[PDB]
Design a binder for these strands. Sequence first.
RNA 1: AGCAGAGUGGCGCAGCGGAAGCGUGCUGGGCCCAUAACCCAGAGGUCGAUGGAUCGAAACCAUCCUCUGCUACCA
Lengths: 275, 356, 138
Amino acid sequence: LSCRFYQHKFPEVEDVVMVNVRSIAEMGAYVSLLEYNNIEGMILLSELSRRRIRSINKLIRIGRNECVVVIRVDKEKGYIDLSKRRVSPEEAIKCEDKFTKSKTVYSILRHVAEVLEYTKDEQLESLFQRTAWVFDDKYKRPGYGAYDAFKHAVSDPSILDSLDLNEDEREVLINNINRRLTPQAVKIRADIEVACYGYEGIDAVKEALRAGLNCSTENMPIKINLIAPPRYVMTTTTLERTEGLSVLSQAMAVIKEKIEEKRGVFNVQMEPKVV
Amino acid sequence: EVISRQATINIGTIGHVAHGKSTVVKAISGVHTVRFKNELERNITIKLGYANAKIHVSFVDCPGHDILMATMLNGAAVMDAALLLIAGNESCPQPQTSEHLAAIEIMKLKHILILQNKIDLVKESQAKEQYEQILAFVQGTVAEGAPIIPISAQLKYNIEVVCEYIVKKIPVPPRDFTSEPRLIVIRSVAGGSILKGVLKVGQEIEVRPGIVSKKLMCKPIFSKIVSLFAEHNDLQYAAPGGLIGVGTKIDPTLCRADRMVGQVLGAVGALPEIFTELEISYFLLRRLLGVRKLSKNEVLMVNIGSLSTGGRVSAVKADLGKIVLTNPVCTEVGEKIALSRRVEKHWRLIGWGQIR
Amino acid sequence: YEELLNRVFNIMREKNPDMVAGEKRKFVMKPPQVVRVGTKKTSFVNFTDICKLLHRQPKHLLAFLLAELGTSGSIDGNNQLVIKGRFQQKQIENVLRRYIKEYVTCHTCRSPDTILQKDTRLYFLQCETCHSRCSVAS
RNA sequence: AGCAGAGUGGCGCAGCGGAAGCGUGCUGGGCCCAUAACCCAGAGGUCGAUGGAUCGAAACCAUCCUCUGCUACCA
């Protein structure tokens, strides 16, 4: 089953929706509201762009998806009406971001419902409401807050224990909930030279290396790799960046401070930056 | 078998640009002198070259290009001997062979060999003309005595006779051990030849010039030897001749891109003077050698070790000048100097002398 | 010196009936029989002949040919190659003389054994007669 | 040993978690008495080698190779 992306059925007024086109006529252009259950709609020929038009083939072509702003919605007929002139490209960028994110949520939900052999299609509406639309409610928005929910879900299972699923549904849920969202391997890196010296400058730089290899953090290993005798990349493999960059700069600071007793000067190379 | 020992000789390779000097030096030693990417692409020598082979011999690869000439001259002051390779390309190779010969005459390196390279590529007529040109050019200069042996260094024909001839005619000179110990740093691994005394790994040593600190002045730098090397090989002892590798205590980032280059090295205990002003008794050349009266406040170039440095003449006389340098040079004792002046954006050798 | 005159007569490479080759630049003069439409086409023919016969492998003449005047165009077969714009016969011929002049033949040895190589960063060229470093960049 | 782009469905940039997508150029029409302008239609089918599901892999994501543009400093 293919249904509404969100809990709501018909789109709300003055939103921006990604839509695909079906036909082209004289009095307008028919269209397929992909973001809400593939429901048909029409865009008027006048309601295209506020410029002296020359080629309607150039604007809307049969078979490409574009951004539209919903204009006049009604229910008693269901006459969905869109346009393109009141669309500035910043909203278009946010529209494609939101629709892509919803396609990721729909793809993984299609994956789990298909691998469950959950052919039952109102039960797929039930599965959407039981997990997806309530998580849209839990951050009170579709899309970005849903991304926040699954951003916890692939990492911490605690919010996933706030579901209603059975024994096997969690199995296929984890089987497709993890291996599609975390390729991260975000390793904080900073190549660096410490250009300290003195009369005993051999032991000044070796004391800096002593600090550099004993101020190593445990879960976040501050490793050292030498290519040139004053060159080394500071490397930490930790997944969370806010701890990694902070303890990288703190370790570098204590290294430079204990070798600021002897004349310590710093050859700056790079900054704390994740991948 | 042959003994593994420090190199006893440094042999220079000179001649006109693109004549094939570098290929010949590579042919003799077996090592590639070209360090820089620019030098490889340009097909010219930017920096002073070094290569080693047992005989233990070394080749000093000089630049043919007219602009690069001053660094080669500085290295030549350090050099124990040289070989002049004369290509098939031209009877008059390109002015600089004569200029280096004149510098050698001032320096007193009389023992010279003339090598006729690329005989296969050129005509017999060119060879006869070259013979007459060689006779006229060599006459009246230090080169006059030098023998000429034809060979093709690249092809490797008649090399054995060349090694015996070069060994016989151009011997390695001894050393002057009595003077205060000196090791010469050309690059910054650092390469050079040990002139006197001895150094050991782990021993405290000093770079006599040291460093101009950010009036600003320079205090000599005493430091230690992390390791001891001959070219890219480690040895227990070092003698004159060849490029030996001297390790130092300085951070290599500081030394990087030849920052230390041109300094001299001695033991930490040794007492070298680091002087802004020096007195030199000198004489001047008749003509302007660099092409194909001295006054005060001018900048002249003095070559000591790998370094060349300017200073200003407060007063000028027939044979003496005093100069205050931008960065200090270390003068541990009196020695030999070649004097050059920069004219028309190129450094040209005006004269030579000794520092009293 | 006459010991060494005898040496230059006797330290040569082994005496084969080939002789001195002063300005032996190879005139195998085969300019393209360019058919031009008169507006915006040239057709390089004899291109696989040069492009395989001369020791310069395919796609390596292409960028240098498109370099001169900045004219576009690409493959349409090596023989019968379409290049943007109109050219005269002697000029593109002379560009091929230039191509031989500085890129596949250097005056150290004008011999057709200048086989292609590439070093660590830049295109280098040698010569099996002599094996020199003809690193071309300009 | 550091940083990006690439393993062409017709030239050039690669259009991004569903195959040329577009800008351009070429070939051809239409409009005009003509020309420019503008408009329109077209191109022999593992698009590096390897893993994992997938409705999905030239255009997912990780890996190994090469290439380019950019390194650094000593042999």
